[PDB]
Amino acid sequence: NLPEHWTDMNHQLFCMVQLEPGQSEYNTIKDKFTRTCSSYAIEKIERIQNAFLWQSYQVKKRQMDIKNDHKNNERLLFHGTDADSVPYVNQHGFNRSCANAVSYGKGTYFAVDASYSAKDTYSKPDSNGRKHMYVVRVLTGVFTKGRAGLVTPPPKNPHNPTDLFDSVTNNTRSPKLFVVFFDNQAYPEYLITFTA
Amino acid sequence: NLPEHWTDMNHQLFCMVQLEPGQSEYNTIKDKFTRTCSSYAIEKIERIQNAFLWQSYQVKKRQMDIKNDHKNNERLLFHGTDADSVPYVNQHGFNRSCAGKNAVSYGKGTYFAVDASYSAKDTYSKPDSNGRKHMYVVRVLTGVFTKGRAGLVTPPPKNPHNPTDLFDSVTNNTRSPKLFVVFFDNQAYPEYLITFTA
Numbered sequence: 001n002l003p004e005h006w007t008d009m010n011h012q013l014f015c016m017v018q019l020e021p022g023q024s025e026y027n028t029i030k031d032k033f034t035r036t037c038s039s040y041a042i043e044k045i046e047r048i049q050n051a052f053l054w055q056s057y058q059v060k061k062r063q064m065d066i067k068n069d070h071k072n073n074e075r076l077l078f079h080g081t082d083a084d085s086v087p088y089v090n091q092h093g094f095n096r097s098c099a100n101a102v103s104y105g106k107g108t109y110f111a112v113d114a115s116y117s118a119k120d121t122y123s124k125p126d127s128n129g130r131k132h133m134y135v136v137r138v139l140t141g142v143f144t145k146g147r148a149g150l151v152t153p154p155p156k157n158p159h160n161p162t163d164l165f166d167s168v169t170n171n172t173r174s175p176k177l178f179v180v181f182f183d184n185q186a187y188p189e190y191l192i193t194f195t196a
Numbered sequence: 197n198l199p200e201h202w203t204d205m206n207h208q209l210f211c212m213v214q215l216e217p218g219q220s221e222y223n224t225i226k227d228k229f230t231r232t233c234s235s236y237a238i239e240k241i242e243r244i245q246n247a248f249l250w251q252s253y254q255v256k257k258r259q260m261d262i263k264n265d266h267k268n269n270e271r272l273l274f275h276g277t278d279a280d281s282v283p284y285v286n287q288h289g290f291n292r293s294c295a296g297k298n299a300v301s302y303g304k305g306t307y308f309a310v311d312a313s314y315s316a317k318d319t320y321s322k323p324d325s326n327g328r329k330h331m332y333v334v335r336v337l338t339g340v341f342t343k344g345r346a347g348l349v350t351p352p353p354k355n356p357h358n359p360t361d362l363f364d365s366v367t368n369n370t371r372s373p374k375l376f377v378v379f380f381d382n383q384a385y386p387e388y389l390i391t392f393t394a
């Protein structure tokens with residue numbers, strides 16, 4: 001059911017857990033961020049333990065692993081958001097109806113590089129200069145190049161137009177962004193609070 | 197895993213099952229339909245057996261049953277649509293990103309009718325090139341609801357000082373609900389497709 005690295009929730013279903021600086025889990029997530037954002041200052045990293053979001057995501061993951069006949073469907077990506085959206089994402093995940101640029105489709109956008117999500121247009125500095133970025137488990141699955149105005153990914157072969165790609169990208173050979181068009185294709189795993 | 201009265205699907209993920217008149221299952225849907233739509237005639241009623249949509253929907257239902265306090269969270273509602281949308285809905289369900297602007301808008305989501313007569317309007321159940329009209333009968337997790345408003349992209353909060361604790365859906369009128377709007381994927385399961393004609 002619930003992942004091993006999660007800590008006890010006293011029979012509750014939602015908790016934001018601040019990570020201890022210098023332990024393995026904190027160090028792994030900090031490393032992913034500082035690869036492109038070494039010039040920023042990390043205030044804290046919180047593990048998001050949202051049982052409902054996790055359950056709905058794990059269901060979609062098992063479905064995509066069955067449909068794709070292989071289990072290489074997940075990537076870790078970044079998502080910058082404004083402070084006022086943070087409670088929403090913690091509790092409800094990412095909502096294409098809320099989503100800035102949509103040149104590759106009307107979905108939720110995720111960056112390969114923290115540096116892209118660190119842009120003020122995405123991770124808007126709050127009145128205290130705090131910026132907020134998620135590390136997100138994303139079911140990118142089998143992907144294709146996106147285009148403006150997509151409401152879902154294109155068909156995997158427009159002879160069978162309901163069999164869809166899982167996500168779209170800017171560039172299939174060297175992707176820097178992914179767009180997903182369904183709820184529960186993305187699990188917000190950590191929230192990084194940082195400053196310029 | 198799947199309802200024990202579904203047809204054996206032979207490790208296939210999706211089947212449409214044609215129902216037989218005189219069976220309770222057909223006759224109950226026909227009665228629900230003809231209660232407001234006696235001037236149309238049913239061609240056929242198909243049960244939709246979509247394993248993945250059922251799984252995702254049932255998880256959302258379990259979640260809402262846990263969250264809410266012994267509420268009847270699920271209603272059986274109608275959805276009229278055009279022929280062009282039927283294969284998508286059968287396979288992928290109801291997508292708010294594809295939704296029509298309703299003549300009376302209570303938010304930017306997917307609309308479901310209490311009365312078949314509403315879904316039977318040509319604006320929704322557009323007759324195809326053969327004069328067939330299509331209406332789903334849908335399990336909808338309405339949960340705890342409030343009157344909607346045209347600007348909504350999710351249900352409103354129950355409490356403006358806790359913006360993330362949302363109503364489950366919105367309606368046109370809480371005293372006499374005739375439509376519901378839902379704003380999330382897997383909150384509605386297309387259970388039957390009614391094909392009907394003038």
Ligand SMILES: O=c1[nH][nH]c(=O)c2cc(OCc3cccc(F)c3)ccc12
Pocket residue numbers: 078079080081099100101102103104109110111116117118122123170177
């Ligand atoms: O981290 C993000 N948070 N919120 C976003 O909307 C977002 C958007 C985003 O790509 C937008 C885009 C569109 C077209 C061309 C581009 F080069 C880039 C990348 C990251 C983010």
